[PDB]
Enzyme design. Structure first.
Site, short mmCIF file in Angstrom:
data_model
loop_
_atom_site.label_atom_id
_atom_site.label_comp_id
_atom_site.label_asym_id
_atom_site.label_seq_id
_atom_site.Cartn_x
_atom_site.Cartn_y
_atom_site.Cartn_z
N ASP A 1 48.14 32.19 38.99
CA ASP A 1 48.08 32.76 37.67
C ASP A 1 48.04 34.16 37.81
O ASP A 1 46.97 34.79 37.41
CB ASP A 1 46.76 32.39 37.16
CG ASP A 1 46.50 32.78 35.69
OD1 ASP A 1 47.46 32.82 34.95
OD2 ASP A 1 45.31 32.90 35.37
N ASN B 1 42.78 30.05 48.25
CA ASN B 1 42.39 29.95 46.98
C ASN B 1 42.71 28.54 46.18
O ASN B 1 44.06 28.66 45.98
CB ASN B 1 42.64 31.07 46.16
CG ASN B 1 42.01 30.92 44.81
OD1 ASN B 1 40.76 31.25 44.39
ND2 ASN B 1 42.71 30.61 43.79
N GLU B 2 42.07 27.51 46.17
CA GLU B 2 42.45 26.32 45.38
C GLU B 2 43.78 25.64 46.03
O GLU B 2 44.64 25.29 45.31
CB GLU B 2 42.68 26.71 44.00
CG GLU B 2 41.35 27.19 43.28
CD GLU B 2 41.40 27.43 41.75
OE1 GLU B 2 42.59 27.20 41.28
OE2 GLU B 2 40.41 27.61 41.19
N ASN C 1 35.17 27.82 42.64
CA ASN C 1 35.82 28.24 41.29
C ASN C 1 35.57 27.14 40.54
O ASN C 1 35.88 25.97 40.31
CB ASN C 1 37.26 28.38 41.25
CG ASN C 1 37.58 29.60 42.35
OD1 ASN C 1 36.73 30.39 42.99
ND2 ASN C 1 38.90 29.75 42.71
N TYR D 1 34.92 26.28 35.74
CA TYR D 1 34.95 26.87 34.46
C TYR D 1 34.55 25.56 33.77
O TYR D 1 35.10 25.23 32.61
CB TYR D 1 36.49 26.97 34.25
CG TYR D 1 37.18 28.23 35.00
CD1 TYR D 1 36.99 29.36 34.42
CD2 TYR D 1 37.80 27.84 36.03
CE1 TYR D 1 37.44 30.50 35.12
CE2 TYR D 1 38.06 29.30 37.10
CZ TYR D 1 38.20 30.23 36.57
OH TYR D 1 38.60 31.46 37.00
N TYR E 1 37.59 25.45 30.53
CA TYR E 1 38.63 24.47 30.86
C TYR E 1 38.15 22.88 30.54
O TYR E 1 38.74 22.24 30.35
CB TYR E 1 39.42 24.65 32.37
CG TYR E 1 40.19 26.03 32.41
CD1 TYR E 1 41.18 26.19 31.33
CD2 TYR E 1 39.84 26.59 33.49
CE1 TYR E 1 41.86 27.35 31.41
CE2 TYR E 1 40.79 27.94 33.54
CZ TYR E 1 41.83 28.18 32.61
OH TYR E 1 42.56 29.26 32.86
N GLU F 1 34.55 32.13 41.06
CA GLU F 1 35.10 32.19 39.85
C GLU F 1 34.35 31.67 38.89
O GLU F 1 33.78 30.35 39.16
CB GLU F 1 36.68 31.67 39.50
CG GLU F 1 37.60 32.60 40.68
CD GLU F 1 39.01 32.15 40.53
OE1 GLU F 1 39.27 31.42 39.42
OE2 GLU F 1 39.76 32.46 41.47
N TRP G 1 35.07 35.84 37.43
CA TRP G 1 36.28 35.94 37.07
C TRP G 1 36.50 36.48 35.69
O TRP G 1 36.15 35.66 34.76
CB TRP G 1 37.05 34.59 37.39
CG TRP G 1 38.59 34.96 37.29
CD1 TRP G 1 39.45 34.56 36.41
CD2 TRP G 1 39.19 35.29 38.76
NE1 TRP G 1 40.90 34.76 36.95
CE2 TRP G 1 40.53 35.33 38.19
CE3 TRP G 1 38.75 36.01 39.55
CZ2 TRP G 1 41.46 35.72 39.04
CZ3 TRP G 1 39.90 36.26 40.59
CH2 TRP G 1 41.15 36.34 40.27
N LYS H 1 40.16 36.92 31.02
CA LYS H 1 38.88 36.68 31.41
C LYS H 1 38.01 37.88 31.89
O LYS H 1 37.00 37.84 32.68
CB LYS H 1 38.91 35.55 32.43
CG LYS H 1 39.37 34.35 31.98
CD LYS H 1 39.05 33.11 32.83
CE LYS H 1 39.60 31.83 32.36
NZ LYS H 1 41.02 31.68 32.14
O1 LIG Z 1 42.43 30.06 35.20
C1 LIG Z 1 42.14 31.47 35.60
O2 LIG Z 1 41.79 32.23 34.69
C2 LIG Z 1 41.95 31.54 36.83
O3 LIG Z 1 41.70 30.13 37.62
C3 LIG Z 1 41.74 29.76 38.95
O4 LIG Z 1 41.42 28.81 39.24
C4 LIG Z 1 42.27 30.77 39.73
O5 LIG Z 1 41.86 30.84 41.05
C5 LIG Z 1 42.51 32.20 39.22
O6 LIG Z 1 43.45 32.95 40.03
C6 LIG Z 1 43.18 31.90 37.63
O7 LIG Z 1 43.45 33.36 37.06
#
Ligand SMILES: O=C(O)[C@H]1OC(=O)[C@H](O)[C@@H](O)[C@@H]1O
Ligand SMILES: O=C(O)[C@H]1OC(=O)[C@H](O)[C@@H](O)[C@@H]1O
Lengths: 576, 582
Positions: free
Chosen positions: B166, B402-403, B457, B459, B463, B497, B542, B561
């Protein structure tokens, strides 16, 4: 001048080393640095990027708005091989005024914040050692130096700049800084002028050196082949089948100036130049003997966070945007820009009106005149050999309706004439109060530049049809004077907030910016002697805070991050 | 490594000249440059700023979105006095891969777009003359190099980058470029490691040179006074009453490494370092034997028009903003940054989690032939990152992914090799980690035991169960953290994040997803969860600032974000962090 304005180069005779990077920096609100040994090192510095304006880095008001004395310092290693060359510090600018120290010694001082400062450190430099440079800078505004303003003192001794001009008082070391080494006998200046002879051309030149040895001058074409060669500090280079520098279609030769003795070469200076002529004939502006209509913008040196700090990326984006609009010209409103802007205009075939910072205009006037003439001399000496520079703007909206003003500007124009080897057009931009019936200074101008805001500051919005009639009434008065000179509009525009849409339009909307421009074009196109239009401004830019400025000036056709409002397409389509 | 990662300096033994400025540039859509002799000069170039990403200068889509081969050229005068030195071109990075030519001769190639490229031009350099450098660069994405992606070919042959990550595929010469001259026998590498002994400290070191002459190592304090000196390529410096480098309260010594022969000094390398220790003890992150709670952000190298182009101005503004929020830490999401960011963190006392570009390894976003090649690339990038960055006191941990996929035995074997490589290259053996996505469920993940602390990470409230479901999001979040709690791993957890896209100026009462108010409420909910678990020891939001991504239906002019806007101004949520982190 007592130093060279020539852009620094690196070859067998000349050396250069960049001092750009993170410098040490300290504010001096109590004005005690020179009393306290700061020229030998700052006592409690923070880091500051160079080149940049300092203001927009900080998160607190008092640092952003700082007005007064402030200091920069850095250290650099000087190669041993520079020993007994002429060694100079070269600042692209020091804004607004400053004193340069090197290894604890005072070297030079300069007033004027938009042109190079040269400091001869030959006698204090330490080759093969670490050296120190410290600069004391001041950014106050007054009425004896350009650009003009005042300094307000708040109720605790804190100073605040009060400009008489509509742009933020950015300051600091906003351009690149070099240390350079020159041969003891060097090329200090040169000038070129052009004459067209059918398919051939003449490059007339003068060279100033710091000695008496012979000079050889060569001209190379774009691929480095020799096309002309002559001997002497004054001469003519004859160019067969010359490839002229044309609007939006540049071609650049390379001039090579050698100082010789024997046997060998003592110095070599090289620079790209473009063979072109500009003259005013009747109501026409002629470029290489053909009429050109100026199409473009007033700009600023202004970008988020960097302030006026120079960066080639800003140059690249801005020229791509200019080309996309089909522009051919800009004015360096309201101060000379970094040299690199002109280098790039030379490459891209853009026309530049180069402007001295005479904006924001008593017993102080004689001192102001001295400052104005000095800045004019420095600008012309620095910029004269760029093919892009086709005119000098010597003022922006001064008082012009008194005999005193006439005597003042006579002196400025006289100085400009003595310094420009090409005698190219000289002008300035007039504000509305310079009425056709009252103005005493327009006769000094090779062509006339008008800043007008009929439809914004005068009869805006619901009164725009009245604004158009007022505009035509004024232009009819100019027409009736039959001056037989070209007129160029150097400013016209509306503040426009990106995203503010309204039907029917309102002042500040994107739609009104379009309608205002269309009205102005209708008026321009009604007068034969109008020969150019430079919109105010290329892009939204920072100003002093106040009730009339919504995060700076929004008369940009582009946003501050260089994206087009609706009006940008209007220009693109018209200028195509 | 067949070259030095050491940052270039200027002194009696070492010279440097910047090649930053306007270069010549030409796109090569037909892939004809090399067969057309472009390494001897580009035939129809335009001007391109260096350092900068090329994409956002142009006004047309096809140039902005260019994917494939493209070329850079410049010329430089080499001082005669550099003859008989070892002469190198040094690129801060070449994004993503390239081949360096000098004076028409192929010098070296490199894959990996975020670490230095060193090209030895000693045998072709012409001292006292103008010299030429030409670089062939390619910015395609694939599954055998980092960061991963694909390349799509449009009907007409035009290539388009398709990231599995992303952020926008910025590329070019994004960092400073130098030509440098080194002595024939030089300091190539060194490492320091620290031990605290009461009021005193030990600086353990190793030095690697390109010859066999003796080495002297000195340590100077912040005023240039000698505090320790010893001899040998391996040794210990004893520092009485050591002034430790502390969080948000830096102190930097200067290490001075000399090579000598019987008649004098052959080389001198100097760098600022900070005496500090980092270790994990149970659920605590210890800095100089005291627990620290990480507070800060994931960042990007991202700024209007310049793209990822380096500028000290961006560093200065970003650190002023970081300090105003009372942060103490950032992660170099998702690639090593320009070296200058670490130099400045060292001065400002910021903690850095240094991350290799191992992003885009998600199975959902994206087969047994490419993984061994990918592993080799991943290990090479890890080795280069650690060799470059190990001596910064700011760097307290390595993030090695990362992920990625982590729920299979094969992923465990893959990452075991990466972590083993990292251990081999880090003289300090400092904490190692990576950031996990939610699919790495506590019941399924096989890789978190490789980590010294765990980075998540998450959300919950963006999400997952966003907006009107945020109360459900909180419950789901607590459910997951209760599962982690019941595993009693006794390791620190850091949230690397969490955030919401937020459009500056979008206000709503009651809040909606994308509004400034929802960003605040989301953050408050996340803090309530964080603060419910003892083992949470850090929070990196993040993102620090809005940043550019690939265009799409889910990205409104990039990723919003940010807590700051792209031009570095605070949204409402920035004050929420300032107040909490105070
Ligand atoms: O979806 C997002 O904003 C973020 O999500 C994540 O999991 C990623 O590690 C990051 O690079 C993206 O920018
Ligand atoms: O008011 C404005 O927008 C402009 O007006 C002018 O007359 C000035 O020459 C220009 O510098 C201002 O920015």
């Amino acid at each position: 001048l007592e130093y060279s304005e020539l852009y620094p180069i690196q070859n067998e005779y000349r050396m250069m080393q960049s001092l750009d990077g993170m410098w040490k920096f300290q504010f001096d609100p109590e004005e005690i640095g020179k009393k306290s040994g700061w020229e030998n090192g700052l006592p409690a510095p923070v880091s500051m990027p160079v080149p940049s304006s300092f203001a927009d880095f900080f998160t607190d008001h008092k640092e952003r708005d700082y007005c007064g004395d402030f200091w920069y310092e850095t250290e650099f290693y000087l190669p041993a091989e520079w020993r007994n060359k002429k060694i100079w510090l070269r600042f692209g600018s020091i804004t607004h005024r400053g004193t340069v120290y090197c290894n604890g010694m005072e070297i030079t001082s300069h007033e004027g914040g938009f042109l190079p400062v040269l400091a001869d450190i030959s006698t204090v430099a330490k080759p093969g050692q670490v050296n120190q440079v410290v600069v004391k800078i001041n950014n106050e505004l007054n009425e004896t130096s350009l650009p003009c303003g005042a300094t307000k003192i708040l109720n605790n001794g804190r100073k605040l700049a009060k400009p008489y001009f509509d742009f933020f008082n950015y300051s600091g070391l906003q351009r690149s800084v070099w240390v350079i080494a020159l041969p003891e006998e060097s090329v200090k200046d040169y000038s070129v002028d052009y004459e067209l002879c059918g398919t051939d051309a003449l490059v007339k030149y003068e060279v100033v050196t710091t000695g008496e040895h012979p000079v050889i001058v060569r001209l190379l074409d774009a691929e480095g082949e020799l096309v002309a060669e002559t001997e002497g500090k004054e001469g003519i280079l004859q160019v067969a089948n010359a490839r002229l520098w044309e609007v939006r279609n540049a071609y650049l030769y390379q001039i090579v100036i050698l100082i010789t003795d024997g046997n060998g070469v003592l110095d070599e200076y090289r620079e790209k130049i473009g063979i072109r002529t500009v003259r005013i004939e009747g109501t026409k502006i002629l470029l290489n003997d053909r009429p050109v209509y100026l199409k473009g913008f007033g700009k600023h040196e202004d970008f988020p966070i960097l302030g006026r700090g120079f960066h080639w990326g800003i140059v690249k984006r801005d020229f791509e945007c200019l080309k996309w609009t089909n522009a051919n010209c800009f004015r360096t409103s309201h101060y000379p820009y970094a040299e690199e802007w002109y280098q790039f205009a030379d490459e891209e075939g853009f026309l530049i009106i180069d402007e001295v910072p005479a904006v924001g205009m008593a017993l102080t006037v004689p001192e102001l005149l001295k400052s104005h003439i000095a800045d004019t001399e420095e600008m012309i000496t620095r910029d004269k050999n760029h093919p892009s520079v086709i005119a000098w703007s010597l003022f922006n909206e001064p008082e012009t309706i008194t005999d005193y003003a006439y005597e003042y500007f006579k002196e400025v124009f006289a100085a400009a004439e003595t310094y420009d080897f090409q005698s190219r057009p000289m002008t300035g931009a007039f504000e509305k109060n310079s009425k056709p019936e009252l103005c005493k200074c327009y006769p000094l101008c090779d062509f006339i530049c008008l800043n007008r805001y009929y439809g914004w500051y005068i009869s805006g919005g619901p009164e725009i049809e009245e604004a158009e009639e007022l505009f035509r009434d004024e232009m009819d008065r100019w027409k009736a004077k039959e001056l037989n000179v070209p007129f160029v509009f150097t400013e016209f525009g509306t503040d426009t907030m990106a995203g503010l849409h309204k039907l029917p339009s309102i002042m500040w909307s994107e739609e009104y910016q379009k309608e205002y421009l269309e009205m102005n074009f209708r008026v321009f196109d009604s007068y034969e002697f109008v020969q150019g239009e430079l919109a105010w401004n290329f892009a939204d830019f920072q100003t002093t805070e106040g009730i009339m400025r919504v995060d700076g000036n929004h008369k940009g056709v582009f946003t501050r991050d260089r994206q087009p409002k609706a009006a940008a397409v209007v220009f693109k389509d018209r200028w195509e």
